[PDB]
A paper describes a structure:
However, only the structure of Crp14 has been determined by X-ray crystallography to a high resolution of 1.67 Å. Crp14 adopts a disulfide-stabilized, three-stranded β-sheet core structure and forms a noncanonical dimer stabilized by asymmetrical interactions between the two β1 strands in parallel. Arg9 and Glu17 form a salt bridge that is conserved in all mammalian α-defensins. This salt bridge rigidifies the first loop connecting β1-β2 (56, 66) and is additionally stabilized by a Lys14 O accepting H-bond from Glu17 N and a Lys14 N donating H-bond to Glu17 Oε1. As shown in the electrostatic potential map, Crp14 is clearly amphiphilic with a cluster of positively charged residues well segregated from a large hydrophobic surface. Crp14 crystallized in space group P6522 with two Crp14 molecules in the asymmetric unit that form an apparent dimer that is different from the dimers of other α-defensins with known crystal structures. Crp14 dimerization is mediated primarily by interactions between the two β1 strands in parallel, in contrast to the dimers of other known α-defensins that dimerize via the interactions of the two β2 strands in antiparallel. Four asymmetric main chain-main chain H-bonds form the basis of the dimer interface, i.e., Leu4a O-Leu4b N, Cys6a N-Leu4b O, Cys6a O-Cys6b N, and Cys8a N-Cys6b O. In addition, Asp3b N donates an H-bond to Asp3a Oδ1 and the side chain of Tyr7 packs against neighboring disulfide bonds in both copies. However, the total buried surface area (BSA) for both dimers is similar, 724 Å2 for the Crp14 dimer compared to 744 Å2 for HNP1. As shown in the dimeric structure of Crp14, the two side chains of Thr10 directly point toward each other, 8.3 Å apart between Thr10 Oγ1 atoms, such that a T10K variation may be energetically unfavorable for cryptdin dimerization due to electrostatic repulsion.
Numbering used by the authors:
A (entry chain A), B (entry chain B): 3 to 35
The structure:
């Protein structure tokens, strides 16, 4: 599987940008490793 | 697949803590579903 973080800015080291996600009905980055 | 949010107020009822995370140099719950 995949562990993904829904982040307010960009993705961390070694994380993949796996499209976007929503938090508080606002666009965020889906960062997965 | 797991999607995790670093939440200022804590985890939704359908989420579960999964350790902590940092946000604005402050410690918060990491909440995943």
């Amino acid at each position: 599987d995949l562990v993904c973080y829904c982040r307010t800015r960009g993705c961390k080291r070694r994380e993949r940008m796996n499209g976007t996600c929503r938090k508080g009905h606002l666009m965020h980055t889906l960062c997965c490793r």
